[PDB]
Design a protein around this ligand. Structure first.
Ligand code: MTA
Ligand code: CA
Ligand code: CA
Length: 220
């Protein structure tokens, strides 16, 4: 039995996403067919977005038709589930600066018409400005101390007014000694001067330690 989750485009195999490319697995994940309609396993130990959803995040904003700027796409594992979610009329702009990871992303996009690989450094969005059109959501998982400044720069460049951000923050990646709680609070403090308004925060439960997701609205 597979049923729709509260989040549109997300499903619960009593977590899964509807396969944009039936019969194909991206990174070895298993799938289930319901009669005709194929779904792919979405693992919360592997995907911070899956973990947040299981952990009861109120909004993810990534939904059918959404245009998503994805910072830190890596090889495309979570990106592939985002691609399923946004569907044929949505888009996933997958920013990754590793050329090796880039190769897997590029190969992934060959099979998935809604993924746009962007193999560039997210710190310099002016360099890839022509490749990206305004987006509805920024999802960020770059694991960098300056991630908040990165998201802000990308927001001013690409995120529509009223658009949202979903930001994965590994505390010990910003400051290895500080309490996670103090790290989260410091990051959230930085957002006011960019007109980024946090709306919720949650930590990623048993899947990831001292790891928060912050969801908010930009230029509301
Ligand atoms: C899913 S893990 C974190 C990913 O973010 C990527 N990343 C880190 N810094 C940057 C940057 N400045 N621009 C683009 N991707 C980055 C890393 O190469 C890794 O694949
Ligand atoms: Ca296309
Ligand atoms: Ca600034």
């Amino acid at each position: 039995m597979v049923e729709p989750h509260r989040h549109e485009g997300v499903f619960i195999c009593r977590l899964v996403t509807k396969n944009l490319v039936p019969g194909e697995s991206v990174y070895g994940e298993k799938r289930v067919s319901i009669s005709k309609i194929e779904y792919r396993a979405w693992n919360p130990f592997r995907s911070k977005l899956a973990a947040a959803i299981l952990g009861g995040v109120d909004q993810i904003h990534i939904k059918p038709g959404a245009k998503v700027l994805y910072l830190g796409a890596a090889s495309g594992t979570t990106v592939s589930h985002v691609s399923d979610i946004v569907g044929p009329d949505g888009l996933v702009y997958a920013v990754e600066f590793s050329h090796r990871s880039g190769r897997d992303l590029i190969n992934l996009a060959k099979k998935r018409t809604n993924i746009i690989p962007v193999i560039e450094d997210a710190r310099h969005p002016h360099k890839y400005r022509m490749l990206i059109a305004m987006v509805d959501v920024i999802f960020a998982d770059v694991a960098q101390p300056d991630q908040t400044r990165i998201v802000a720069l990308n927001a001013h460049t690409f995120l529509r007014n009223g658009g949202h951000f979903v930001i994965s923050i590994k505390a010990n990646c910003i400051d290895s000694t500080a309490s996670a709680e103090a790290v989260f609070a410091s990051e959230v403090k930085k957002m006011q001067q960019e007109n980024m308004k946090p709306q919720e925060q949650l930590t990623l439960e048993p899947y990831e330690r001292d790891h928060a997701v912050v969801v908010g609205v930009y230029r509301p």
